[PDB]
Amino acid sequence: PSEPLTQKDVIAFQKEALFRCLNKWRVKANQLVEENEVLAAGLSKTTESVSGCCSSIVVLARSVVEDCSDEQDKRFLQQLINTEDEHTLTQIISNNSARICELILKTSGSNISDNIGRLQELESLTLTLQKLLKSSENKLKKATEYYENIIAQYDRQDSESVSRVFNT
Amino acid sequence: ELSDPSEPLTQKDVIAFQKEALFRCLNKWRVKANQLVEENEVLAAGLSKTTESVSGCCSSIVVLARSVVEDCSDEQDKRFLQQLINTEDEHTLTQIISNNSARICELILKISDNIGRLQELESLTLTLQKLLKSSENKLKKATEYYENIIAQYDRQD
Amino acid sequence: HMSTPARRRLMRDFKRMKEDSPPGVSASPLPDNVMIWNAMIIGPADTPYEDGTFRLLLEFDEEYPNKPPHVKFLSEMFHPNVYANGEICLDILQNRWTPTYDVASILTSIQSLFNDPNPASPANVEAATLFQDHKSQYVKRVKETVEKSWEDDMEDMAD
């Protein structure tokens, strides 16, 4: 084989081959962290800019619900206004895109928002969600080290060399 | 293939310690590289799936913009609405709409500080819920990846 | 020849190494020059230097054990207390020496620097500022020297 698969199998392999194999994975891991960092960056930069458009439709929906008359359309704007799942929201907008433009123009004039409580409710939620995102990513960051530790310590516990040098 | 413990070490006993150590380091890198391709595809997949979903909004915004240019008054705004309507590259259009969302909603309708605050809050409310979901999903899928290898060790014979 | 009080003791230290060698420690005086020693420490577990094969060079003096030896790392290093050429900034080797310290005592004292570096002497200003504030990046950089240490075939350890 080109690369060894077990700790038992390495005794036959020369060092120069083991080094060549280690670097290929080490270099592959470094390219992959750069790819993972830049990809997770571009995924956040896109979700902010997609939410830019999505929110503008939600804002226009909130502005015209008061003057809409038939409630099956008001229920549609309400269902649209209060969802926070972009897949849900984007489907609602993609599937009914013309209807939305119709309901926005059909309203006679620009009407004032009546609720500041939703802005406080969002302000509190905005803070709670920022706190939850950092704690969720931290749970993931410590876990990558934690799981890679237990996997590596299984190889150490079964090693003949380690048990010879250090075990008393 | 080693020697007696209560003895000074040998050139053979240290070459064997390096090889067994080189493998453990090799394995630690191998597991780190495999976990990343799983996350990198799920990231590159979700990155394309998110850009596709904006076209519902972008098209709906351009038609709403065109509906009001004929009745628009301010020429710096009339030129701005035209600049919005005439951008073909959708990447440009999505940011032009995202960056200038407050200007857009007002120009379609014809209080203003409430719009700036609900757009800032709605965009962030939407952005964070999705970012938390993918982070919880990145955490869920990653735990599964490592515990797959853990299970193969906890029963290996 | 082996009549000098210093040379006499160095052979006394060597006997101990030959019979009670500390875990992860190797040491052998040059077969002809009994004043220069080849040494090799293995980084203890649960330390960023874990499983490294770090080579040392102990140079002694005619006054030993009354005078400390000169100690140089030969493997490449990243430690707050190790200068860029291998020279260690250890207390028992500088101003806290003692004749009750044989070779083993010095090689285990250097070994213990791996788990807890002395923050007082930053020989490596980068290693010290990494170890104090940015510990995750510290371990990332220490492990790159652990990998290099493996390259040497330990020819210095043969008979």
PDB file of all heavy atoms in Angstrom, chain C residues 29-41:
ATOM      1  N   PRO C  29      27.798  10.023  27.571  1.00  0.00           N
ATOM      2  CA  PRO C  29      29.018  10.788  27.295  1.00  0.00           C
ATOM      3  C   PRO C  29      29.723  10.250  26.063  1.00  0.00           C
ATOM      4  O   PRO C  29      29.684   9.048  25.784  1.00  0.00           O
ATOM      5  CB  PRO C  29      29.862  10.579  28.556  1.00  0.00           C
ATOM      6  CG  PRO C  29      29.326   9.337  29.173  1.00  0.00           C
ATOM      7  CD  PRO C  29      27.861   9.346  28.874  1.00  0.00           C
ATOM      8  N   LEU C  30      30.331  11.155  25.301  1.00  0.00           N
ATOM      9  CA  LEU C  30      31.106  10.743  24.141  1.00  0.00           C
ATOM     10  C   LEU C  30      32.120   9.680  24.563  1.00  0.00           C
ATOM     11  O   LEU C  30      32.743   9.811  25.625  1.00  0.00           O
ATOM     12  CB  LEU C  30      31.826  11.941  23.515  1.00  0.00           C
ATOM     13  CG  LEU C  30      31.189  12.638  22.311  1.00  0.00           C
ATOM     14  CD1 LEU C  30      29.889  13.316  22.699  1.00  0.00           C
ATOM     15  CD2 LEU C  30      32.161  13.634  21.698  1.00  0.00           C
ATOM     16  N   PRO C  31      32.293   8.613  23.777  1.00  0.00           N
ATOM     17  CA  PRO C  31      33.164   7.504  24.214  1.00  0.00           C
ATOM     18  C   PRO C  31      34.578   7.925  24.578  1.00  0.00           C
ATOM     19  O   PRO C  31      35.167   7.358  25.508  1.00  0.00           O
ATOM     20  CB  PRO C  31      33.146   6.552  23.008  1.00  0.00           C
ATOM     21  CG  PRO C  31      32.622   7.370  21.861  1.00  0.00           C
ATOM     22  CD  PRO C  31      31.689   8.365  22.461  1.00  0.00           C
ATOM     23  N   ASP C  32      35.141   8.911  23.883  1.00  0.00           N
ATOM     24  CA  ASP C  32      36.473   9.413  24.192  1.00  0.00           C
ATOM     25  C   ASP C  32      36.440  10.647  25.089  1.00  0.00           C
ATOM     26  O   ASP C  32      37.118  10.676  26.120  1.00  0.00           O
ATOM     27  CB  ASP C  32      37.226   9.717  22.891  1.00  0.00           C
ATOM     28  CG  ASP C  32      36.381  10.486  21.894  1.00  0.00           C
ATOM     29  OD1 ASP C  32      35.236  10.843  22.241  1.00  0.00           O
ATOM     30  OD2 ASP C  32      36.858  10.731  20.766  1.00  0.00           O
ATOM     31  N   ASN C  33      35.668  11.667  24.721  1.00  0.00           N
ATOM     32  CA  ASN C  33      35.569  12.898  25.501  1.00  0.00           C
ATOM     33  C   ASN C  33      34.430  12.721  26.500  1.00  0.00           C
ATOM     34  O   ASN C  33      33.263  12.643  26.111  1.00  0.00           O
ATOM     35  CB  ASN C  33      35.332  14.096  24.583  1.00  0.00           C
ATOM     36  CG  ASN C  33      35.287  15.419  25.330  1.00  0.00           C
ATOM     37  OD1 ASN C  33      35.474  15.474  26.546  1.00  0.00           O
ATOM     38  ND2 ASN C  33      35.039  16.498  24.596  1.00  0.00           N
ATOM     39  N   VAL C  34      34.764  12.671  27.784  1.00  0.00           N
ATOM     40  CA  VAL C  34      33.779  12.341  28.805  1.00  0.00           C
ATOM     41  C   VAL C  34      33.199  13.640  29.345  1.00  0.00           C
ATOM     42  O   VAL C  34      32.513  13.656  30.372  1.00  0.00           O
ATOM     43  CB  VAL C  34      34.413  11.491  29.923  1.00  0.00           C
ATOM     44  CG1 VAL C  34      33.352  10.723  30.703  1.00  0.00           C
ATOM     45  CG2 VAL C  34      35.451  10.538  29.334  1.00  0.00           C
ATOM     46  N   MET C  35      33.473  14.740  28.653  1.00  0.00           N
ATOM     47  CA  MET C  35      33.016  16.047  29.097  1.00  0.00           C
ATOM     48  C   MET C  35      31.851  16.560  28.256  1.00  0.00           C
ATOM     49  O   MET C  35      31.154  17.496  28.648  1.00  0.00           O
ATOM     50  CB  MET C  35      34.174  17.041  29.067  1.00  0.00           C
ATOM     51  CG  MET C  35      35.373  16.598  29.897  1.00  0.00           C
ATOM     52  SD  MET C  35      35.018  16.639  31.815  1.00  0.00           S
ATOM     53  CE  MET C  35      34.524  18.508  31.939  1.00  0.00           C
ATOM     54  N   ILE C  36      31.639  15.940  27.098  1.00  0.00           N
ATOM     55  CA  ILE C  36      30.539  16.286  26.207  1.00  0.00           C
ATOM     56  C   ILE C  36      29.564  15.119  26.175  1.00  0.00           C
ATOM     57  O   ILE C  36      29.969  13.969  25.963  1.00  0.00           O
ATOM     58  CB  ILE C  36      31.048  16.616  24.794  1.00  0.00           C
ATOM     59  CG1 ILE C  36      31.949  17.851  24.824  1.00  0.00           C
ATOM     60  CG2 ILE C  36      29.888  16.826  23.842  1.00  0.00           C
ATOM     61  CD1 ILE C  36      32.404  18.300  23.453  1.00  0.00           C
ATOM     62  N   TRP C  37      28.281  15.412  26.382  1.00  0.00           N
ATOM     63  CA  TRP C  37      27.247  14.393  26.476  1.00  0.00           C
ATOM     64  C   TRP C  37      26.191  14.605  25.399  1.00  0.00           C
ATOM     65  O   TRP C  37      25.783  15.738  25.126  1.00  0.00           O
ATOM     66  CB  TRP C  37      26.575  14.401  27.854  1.00  0.00           C
ATOM     67  CG  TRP C  37      27.388  13.780  28.947  1.00  0.00           C
ATOM     68  CD1 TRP C  37      28.717  13.971  29.198  1.00  0.00           C
ATOM     69  CD2 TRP C  37      26.922  12.854  29.936  1.00  0.00           C
ATOM     70  NE1 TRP C  37      29.103  13.228  30.288  1.00  0.00           N
ATOM     71  CE2 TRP C  37      28.020  12.531  30.758  1.00  0.00           C
ATOM     72  CE3 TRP C  37      25.681  12.268  30.208  1.00  0.00           C
ATOM     73  CZ2 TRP C  37      27.916  11.650  31.831  1.00  0.00           C
ATOM     74  CZ3 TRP C  37      25.580  11.391  31.274  1.00  0.00           C
ATOM     75  CH2 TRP C  37      26.690  11.092  32.074  1.00  0.00           C
ATOM     76  N   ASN C  38      25.760  13.509  24.783  1.00  0.00           N
ATOM     77  CA  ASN C  38      24.590  13.508  23.915  1.00  0.00           C
ATOM     78  C   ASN C  38      23.366  13.117  24.728  1.00  0.00           C
ATOM     79  O   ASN C  38      23.390  12.114  25.448  1.00  0.00           O
ATOM     80  CB  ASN C  38      24.770  12.556  22.732  1.00  0.00           C
ATOM     81  CG  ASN C  38      25.672  13.125  21.661  1.00  0.00           C
ATOM     82  OD1 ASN C  38      25.630  14.320  21.369  1.00  0.00           O
ATOM     83  ND2 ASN C  38      26.500  12.271  21.074  1.00  0.00           N
ATOM     84  N   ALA C  39      22.304  13.905  24.610  1.00  0.00           N
ATOM     85  CA  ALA C  39      21.109  13.706  25.411  1.00  0.00           C
ATOM     86  C   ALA C  39      19.878  13.844  24.526  1.00  0.00           C
ATOM     87  O   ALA C  39      19.916  14.460  23.458  1.00  0.00           O
ATOM     88  CB  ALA C  39      21.036  14.698  26.577  1.00  0.00           C
ATOM     89  N   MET C  40      18.782  13.250  24.985  1.00  0.00           N
ATOM     90  CA  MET C  40      17.547  13.242  24.219  1.00  0.00           C
ATOM     91  C   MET C  40      16.342  13.151  25.149  1.00  0.00           C
ATOM     92  O   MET C  40      16.155  12.151  25.839  1.00  0.00           O
ATOM     93  CB  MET C  40      17.549  12.081  23.220  1.00  0.00           C
ATOM     94  CG  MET C  40      16.426  12.125  22.190  1.00  0.00           C
ATOM     95  SD  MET C  40      14.728  11.433  22.856  1.00  0.00           S
ATOM     96  CE  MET C  40      15.257   9.581  23.156  1.00  0.00           C
ATOM     97  N   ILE C  41      15.529  14.203  25.163  1.00  0.00           N
ATOM     98  CA  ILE C  41      14.322  14.254  25.980  1.00  0.00           C
ATOM     99  C   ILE C  41      13.115  14.010  25.087  1.00  0.00           C
ATOM    100  O   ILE C  41      13.065  14.480  23.943  1.00  0.00           O
ATOM    101  CB  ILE C  41      14.206  15.604  26.715  1.00  0.00           C
ATOM    102  CG1 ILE C  41      15.368  15.790  27.695  1.00  0.00           C
ATOM    103  CG2 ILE C  41      12.883  15.708  27.459  1.00  0.00           C
ATOM    104  CD1 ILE C  41      15.355  17.131  28.419  1.00  0.00           C
TER     105      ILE C  41
END
